[PDB]
Ligand SMILES: OC[C@H]1O[C@@H](O[C@H]2[C@H](O)[C@@H](O)[C@H](O)O[C@@H]2CO)[C@H](O)[C@@H](O)[C@H]1O
């Protein structure tokens with residue numbers, strides 16, 4: 001891996017920002033690897049989370065937020081077009097209303113803001129992946 | 139322009155970071171356009187500047203830093219391989235010792251750190267350019 005995992009990147013996001021994460025799962029899908037991305041409101045890992053994204057590869061994706069320390073209503077989707085053993089490209093685009101989530105160019109979900117994305121001060125990429133690059137674009 | 143100019147982007151830089159700026163001069167070279175990039179230590183434009191980069195297109199590049207509010211010893215180079223009227227790509231790579239500056243893939247200079255690059259909290263892109271994209275990569 002080019003970057004350490006868990007990878008905690010201080011960020012400032014606004015509408016129009018784009019988070020691009022490139023990496024590879026470190027296990028085959030029959031071994032149940034996961035990939036987690038958290039849009040944290042501070043560097044402390046107990047802080048509130050504006051957007052939590054957790055892929056169980058070849059299985060499903062769980063999404064949520066954490067407000068006042070409490071997990072809210074979980075959202076999910078079965079569309080997880082990652083490929084076993086291959087590098088992936090995960091793009092999270094900050095729209096005025098939602099985060100649009102693309103997996104290898106394929107839009108899979110829009111997670112609607114319950115707090116403004118400018119509250120996000122850190123992005124953490126974690127679990128069973130090797131990280132090639134993380135880029136924040138405007 | 140896709141982004142407003144002057145463009146002030148809050149950032150957190152470390153060794154291995156890469157700032158990629160894509161844009162076009164808004165005047166032809168006989169009209170003396172300039173492009174300025176400042177690696178500021180805070181959002182206030184009077185704060186200290188770890189790295190100041192000022193291109194007079196078709197002419198020369200001035201580089202400096204500002205410490206305790208005082209401009210230090212100016213550095214310069216005559217190599218400015220920008221093309222009249224064309225989009226450029228300016229990459230600033232944060233090495234452990236220096237910022238390596240590439241213009242359209244061409245390394246033109248290495249500005250050595252006099253304060254650690256982790257002191258940089260804002261990048262400002264300014265003057266006579268239209269801005270297509272700014273990306274911070276790791
Ligand atoms: O919602 C994301 C959040 O879920 C936690 O696990 C949940 C679990 O998904 C749910 O099925 C069960 O009923 O409650 C658990 C805890 O509230 C994870 O612990 C957490 O890391 C997030 O992934």
Ligand SMILES: OC[C@H]1O[C@@H](O[C@H]2[C@H](O)[C@@H](O)[C@H](O)O[C@@H]2CO)[C@H](O)[C@@H](O)[C@H]1O
Nearest residue numbers: 190192200201202203209210211212213
């Ligand atoms: O050094 C960068 C800094 O220069 C200022 O202008 C200088 C000028 O380049 C120099 O030739 C003259 O002798 O002193 C000036 C001020 O110290 C710019 O004003 C400033 O914006 C930076 O570009």
